[PDB]
């Protein structure tokens, strides 16, 4: 009899169709479909509001509905505006040098602590990197969906890792900062 529901309302601009557990979401920036067949959810849509409606909630089943309605909201927010998870390269004595390579889909970062090897980051499908004139050494990662662009960010901070020496003194590295939704 128990059920966990977090009714989320589709914005007027966005359009969503839920077939099985797969949802196709379209708006302005593009179309993103996510497969949600990893969990039990009566993801009935209807009205102007999607419903997640899990059934017979045991301990884990209470969490799934809210997560899959917050996630479905990230799909709606991304298609209207896009998440611009920007990052700022921070350097000390040796300045970090960044180049956008494959027509804004790739980055090459060098001179991290004068390390001869040049690090290479390829952007995941649906994201683009852009160097920014707005701030010194700011890189803007702009993407249609949060999972695709945020995960690009996870690779960049990880690729630039100081091998040894205490991290508190040796803080050199790129780090994600603003997570705001603006640029595609």
């Amino acid at each position: 009899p128990l059920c966990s529901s977090m009714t989320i309302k589709v914005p007027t601009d966005v359009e969503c169709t839920i077939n099985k557990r797969v949802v196709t979401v379209k708006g302005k920036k593009g179309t993103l479909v996510r497969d949600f067949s990893h969990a039990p959810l009566d993801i009935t849509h209807a009205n102007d509001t999607i419903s997640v409606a899990v059934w017979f909630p045991r301990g884990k089943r209470n969490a799934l509905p809210r997560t899959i309605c917050s996630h479905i909201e990230n799909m709606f927010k991304g298609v209207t505006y896009g998440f611009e998870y920007k990052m700022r390269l921070a350097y000390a004595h040796f300045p970090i040098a960044a180049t956008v390579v494959d027509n804004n889909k790739a980055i090459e970062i060098r001179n991290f602590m004068h390390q001869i090897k040049t690090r290479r980051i390829e952007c995941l499908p649906g994201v683009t990197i852009a160097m920014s004139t707005n701030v010194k050494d700011e890189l803007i990662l702009r993407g249609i969906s949060i999972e695709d662009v945020s995960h690009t960010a996870a690779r960049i901070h990880e690729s630039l890792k100081v091998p040894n020496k205490d991290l508190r003194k040796f803080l050199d590295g790129c780090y994600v900062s603003s997570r705001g939704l603006q640029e595609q």
Partner: protein, 47 residues
């Protein structure tokens, strides 16, 4: 040496918590470290 950037970087690095049993970094406000399940043992170190 950088200013606002070394503050953000400190948040990523210096700011966190370390449980003695797990010997692992944990969220700032977490009641229990994921690895050392449930322990309250905690601490961080600074410059």
């Amino acid at each position: 040496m950088e200013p606002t950037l070394i503050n953000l970087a400190r948040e990523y690095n210096q700011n966190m918590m370390i449980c003695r049993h797990c010997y692992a970094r944990n969220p700032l406000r977490a009641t229990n470290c994921r690895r050392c399940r449930g322990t309250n043992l905690r601490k961080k170190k600074l410059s």
